[PDB]
Amino acid sequence: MTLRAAVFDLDGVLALPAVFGVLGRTEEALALPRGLLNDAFQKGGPEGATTRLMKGEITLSQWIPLMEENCRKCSETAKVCLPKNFSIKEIFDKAISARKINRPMLQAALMLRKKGFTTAILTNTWLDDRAERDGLAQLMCELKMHFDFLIESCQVGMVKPEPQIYKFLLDTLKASPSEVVFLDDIGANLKPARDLGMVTILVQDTDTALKELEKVTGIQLLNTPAPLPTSCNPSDMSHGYVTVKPRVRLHFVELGSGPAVCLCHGFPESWYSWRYQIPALAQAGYRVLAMDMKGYGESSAPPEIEEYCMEVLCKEMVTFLDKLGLSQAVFIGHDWGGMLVWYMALFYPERVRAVASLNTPFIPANPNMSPLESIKANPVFDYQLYFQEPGVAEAELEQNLSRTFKSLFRASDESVLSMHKVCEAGGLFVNSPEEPSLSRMVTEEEIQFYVQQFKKSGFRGPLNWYRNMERNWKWACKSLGRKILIPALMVTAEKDFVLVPQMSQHMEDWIPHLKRGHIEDCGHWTQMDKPTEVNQILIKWLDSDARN
Amino acid sequence: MTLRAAVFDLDGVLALPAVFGVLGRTEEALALPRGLLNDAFQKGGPEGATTRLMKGEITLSQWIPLMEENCRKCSETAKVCLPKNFSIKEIFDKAISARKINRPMLQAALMLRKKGFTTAILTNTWLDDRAERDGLAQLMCELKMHFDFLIESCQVGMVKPEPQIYKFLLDTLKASPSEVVFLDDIGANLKPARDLGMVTILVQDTDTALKELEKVTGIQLLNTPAPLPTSCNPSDMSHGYVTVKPRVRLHFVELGSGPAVCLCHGFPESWYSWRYQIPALAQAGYRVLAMDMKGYGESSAPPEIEEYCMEVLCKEMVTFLDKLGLSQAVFIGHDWGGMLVWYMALFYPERVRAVASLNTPFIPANPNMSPLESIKANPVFDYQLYFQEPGVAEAELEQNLSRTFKSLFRASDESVLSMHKVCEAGGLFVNSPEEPSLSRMVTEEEIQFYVQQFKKSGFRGPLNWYRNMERNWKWACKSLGRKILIPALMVTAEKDFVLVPQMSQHMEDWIPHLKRGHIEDCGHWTQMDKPTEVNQILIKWLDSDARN
Ligand SMILES: Cc1cc(C)c(S(=O)(=O)N2CCC(C(=O)NC3CCCCCC3)CC2)c(C)c1
Ligand SMILES: Cc1cc(C)c(S(=O)(=O)N2CCC(C(=O)NC3CCCCCC3)CC2)c(C)c1
Ligand SMILES: [Mg+2]
Ligand SMILES: [Mg+2]
């Protein structure tokens, strides 16, 4: 055979503690006759309560009392009597919520898909109408985004040992029997797959099943390296648009429910720079609002410089909350977004549930010295002087959009840009390659997404964030007597050689309850460089500080 | 004078229990020297802790301990000692949350705006960084959407008796002193308004203040009738877009935070048909997702009939939840939307937190009789036979979009359409007016919004919802053994002469825990006919059943 499709059972394969493993444990726990609960569950066979449930003829809450019945009649003819407060509902609630995603099996499914396989879930399951049904809904949700097809018995009206369901499977997959693998924890469910000619795998322990699937598929599945978190396909996201002013519309991508978390990218980036965290934080119980900041992507990019001072940027973000009907949001920002997010904490604390910045420290304005001098004080900020003169940086950055982003988006050990003496050399790329190699951090496709976005407005808007140093300074000086006393996290990146960790060292003087995070071996593009640890740090901090 | 601007103080005018009325009560409660708490609050005058707070130099949490200090020093030189567990923080938390919107004053502000006035709030307030700051944030949010300007002392760095702030007020309003009224509970704040020439009103009891504002403005404010709920301006809403299929994008308008409530309009309507409930439910603590259903507005309208059978409509709504990262939503629908929403409960109960329909009852398919006969059984459903032949209803409904909607959208006592014998007469409008009068229920502007929307795709898509009777019937027959056991509400409209209340009378046979609502004097367009009672019924049911 030559396989191009993988089908996975749910209970017992993609989801562990199998629910028959609660049927079984409960018998022992209560010292019931062996298999009594499993007798009652299968009573009637093809035309019994359970098959009707699995076929979607009745709902789970309809089925509970039919099963209680069968536990009575099996408890009559098996010659016992049930314990006084015996509750089938309670046994299944525990079983159902005890069940979790079998992560190695999901990873194996991912890998196969990644290498061109069509994947599907085939499961005997039920229309769940219990009060506590959201648990399983969530689980099914997380799973289904990773597969081409989810085939539920109660949705198709067919059940799983019936040959007809495998005919439906094959037709859904557009495959010949011998082109597909099918893993299931039950022998009887595999026999029919075999008769059409499908490869099959009895799934007992996960590891051995994968070994078989490795052999039969010829792709490394077990022991393979730690994989990146789920990314976003732009065209599958919910896109949102809010006018904040007559000529200014802000765009964002939205995913998940619960407390609002507003993500704010830096220069020269995009909502897409959060691609690795949007799914993770949604999964962690949050409503992510990933912005195209003003000047970028599908947000408006008005040409005037002062449209990008921190004060009008912040007010607009308040209007954004206003129009969305949000009293507050958690504000997490990187680079320029990080700066803005501190200023939202200082100027609109009532609207900020919590504040977090990646890389960008909070340094207060020096009310004596001008910032245009402070920026000459540090050689590594020379590039910001090159950004001042409208037009010059635009022409360089916009003449080869692919080159610009390939050159910028690199890990700390892949540098092709000497940040010092950029005014002298006369360009950010003066002695850098015309066709740079692709970084480890980004696929050609991902880069081209940025290229696509910057073809809308280019770099005027984005560069203007650097062109209000004096105005931002005057504004910031109004906050010099305040402190940030709302919940706040600072995340430093070891090998960000411009927004260096030591710049953050006095931040607790103004943010006394500041919580920190630090990431080893992480360059300036924190999110796409160390997505796993970023997700881990933020989710930890969100749950402890932005919640309860 | 001739006024065209009204300015309202917040504390004591737009918001009641004034916070000085907690300062005062607390002194009495604890038997402290009269005014001690108010001495400590104003200690230092123009350069005291409180003025610095009001000017935004320090935050509220910075101010608490400075005020505790002043309560100590006033408690020294006034010759007493404070009670053992005296907490300034606790006194203000209670005061701040005890304060609510003064509804009659807000109504008066509304009215004035409605009649052309520019309105503004001018308030001495603070950067609020308390743990419990969301309370006040919410309040400020509800208020500010109803005014042209919110001027906060701590935002502008000026405070309210200082003449400079009134210069800023006047400049913000683009008005001459004598063109503006200003109401405040404090005498000193009015003197400066007077010196520039402003009309002023010392606000003691609300009713008398309004009487003065009635006299000075010449518009009836007090005792005026019960006003409609807040509506939506389309261009101020957050618009959202989700691709559910290659050729099908669904659009919706989104407002509020908390549990997801998905609103589903009927035929031939729009997200805009929920204009009266979107704000109310957001305010009640919900995240409203008001759909353009498939076939309408900015949602895709594919021409094929079968793209509109209930089964593909429901699946698409699941994908909509999937892509948005929502495990569940509360589903509330009207007319056709109502039908779909029951079928979401029957086929995807795990995804439906709760279900509610306006007007549309749940009747199960008769598995013997064909629906195309059942629809001939009732003379009032004759119009549905007229909708069957593709093209005929389209030409009539699309030839004068304004006439179509003016003719349709009418209250029960304004009927211009005989629903019976539409096939016979050969048209829904055969003997109806070319230029109908405007209903009580809709402004010319509101109608034109529908006209604008239907110019995109017209009526093919919308009419196709009626063109899958046989297909919907076959599908529905699969549910004949199920019951709806999730939380469910049915709202009947007395004078809907087609979706009549008596059609609902057996619904508890399949929905045993069904909760009901009934609206007197309400026609078919429930939402725009009786918005107040609809909002009241849904919010009540949401809080008791879709929540905790
Ligand atoms: C070696 C090197 C690496 C990198 C990433 C760049 S960069 O692409 O131009 N770059 C882009 C973003 C830049 C940046 O603007 N950083 C922050 C902005 C927030 C306020 C505080 C001032 C500085 C920092 C680094 C440069 C110029 C050199
Ligand atoms: C007197 C009169 C009043 C009204 C509102 C109309 S109507 O505009 O055509 N109209 C539009 C919507 C229509 C309607 O489609 N109602 C429901 C749809 C859900 C499934 C059950 C079948 C019937 C009901 C009433 C008609 C034709 C006559
Ligand atoms: Mg299984
Ligand atoms: Mg006042």
Number of neighbours of residue B433 by Cβ within 10 angstroms: 11
Asked if B152 contacts B142 with a C-beta cutoff of 8 angstroms, the reply is no
Asked if B96 contacts B216 with a C-beta cutoff of 8 angstroms, the reply is no
SS3 of residue B69 by DSSP: helix
Q: What is the dihedral of CA B247, B253, B257, B263, to 10 degrees?
A: -80
The structure's method of determination equals X-ray
The alpha-carbon gap from A434 to the nearest alpha carbon of chain B, in Å, equals 37
CA distances to B18, B382, B385, B389, B480 from B377, in Å? 64, 9, 12, 19, 22
Residue type, B462: P
CA distances to A74, A472, A511, B230, B264 from B253, in Å? 54, 34, 38, 16, 12
- Phi/psi for B262 (5° steps) reads -100, 115
Asked if A287 contacts A240 with a C-beta cutoff of 8 angstroms, the reply is no
A420: enclosing H helix or E strand: none
Instruction: Name the segment(s) of chain B with CATH classification 3.40.50.1000.
Output: 1-17+98-218
What's the gap in Å between B15 CA and the centre of ligand 4? 9
CA distances to B70, B190, B238, B259, B329 from B278, in Å? 46, 38, 12, 14, 15
Q: Which of A272, A308, A386, A466 is catalytic?
A: A466
The alpha-carbon gap from A419 to the nearest alpha carbon of chain B, in Å, equals 37
Name the residue among B11, B200, B232 with its Cα closest to residue B100: B11
Protein residue with least CA distance to atom 28, ligand 2:
B419
For ligand 3, a single-atom ion, the residues with CB < 5 A are A 9, 11-12, 185
What's the gap in Å between B513 CA and the centre of ligand 2? 27
- Cα separation, A338 vs A359, whole angstroms: 8
- Cα separation, B415 vs A484, whole angstroms: 61
Name the residue among B110, B97, B88, B69 with its Cα closest to residue B30: B88
CA distances to A103, B331, B507 from B369, in Å? 50, 29, 20
Residue A524 among the catalytic residues: yes
What's the CATH architecture for A237-548?
A: 3-Layer(aba) Sandwich (3.40)
Question: Would you tell me which residues 303-342 of chain A have a C-beta closer than 8 angstroms to some C-beta of chain B?
Answer: 322-328
CA angle centred on A168, ends A163 and A171, rounded to 5°: 125
Residue type, A519: I
Residue A124 known to bind ligand: yes
Instruction: Name the segment(s) of chain B with CATH classification 1.10.150.240.
Output: 18-97
- Cα separation, A340 vs A209, whole angstroms: 50
What's the gap in Å between B353 CA and the centre of ligand 2? 28
CA distances to A101, A263, A541, B489 from A284, in Å? 15, 15, 11, 31
- Phi/psi for B119 (5° steps) reads -120, 150
Residue B134 known to bind ligand: no
Chain A hits for B349, CB-CB cut-off 8 Å, are 59, 127-129, 133
Asked if B521 contacts B495 with a C-beta cutoff of 8 angstroms, the reply is yes
- Cα separation, A492 vs A503, whole angstroms: 9
**CA A189 to chain CA mean position, Å:** 34
Burial (CB count <10 Å: 0-12, 13-18, 19+), residue B41: buried
CATH topology of domain B1-17+98-218: Rossmann fold (3.40.50)
The alpha-carbon gap from B179 to the nearest alpha carbon of chain A, in Å, equals 26
Does residue B363 have its Cβ closer than 6 Å to ligand 2? Answer: no
Residue type, A233: N
Instruction: Kindly determine whether residue B350 and residue A140, on different chains, have CB atoms separated by under 8 Å.
Output: yes
| A220 Cβ contact partners less than 8 Å away, ≥ 6 residues apart | A111, A214
Name the residue among B343, B237, B247 with its Cα closest to residue B291: B237
Residue A9 known to bind ligand: yes
Question: Within 13 Å and on the Cβ side, how many CA atoms surround B7?
Answer: 30
- Cα separation, B493 vs B266, whole angstroms: 15
A288: enclosing H helix or E strand: strand A287-292
CA dihedral sign of residues A245, A246, A247, A249: positive
Closest A-chain CA to B484: A129
Residue B521 among the catalytic residues: no
Instruction: Name the segment(s) of chain A with CATH classification 3.40.50.1820.
Output: 237-548
- Cα separation, A155 vs A152, whole angstroms: 5
Does residue B420 have its Cβ closer than 6 Å to ligand 2? Answer: no
Q: Which of the four CATH numbers 3.30.200.20, 3.30.360.10, 1.10.150.240, 1.10.357.10 does domain B18-97 have? A: 1.10.150.240
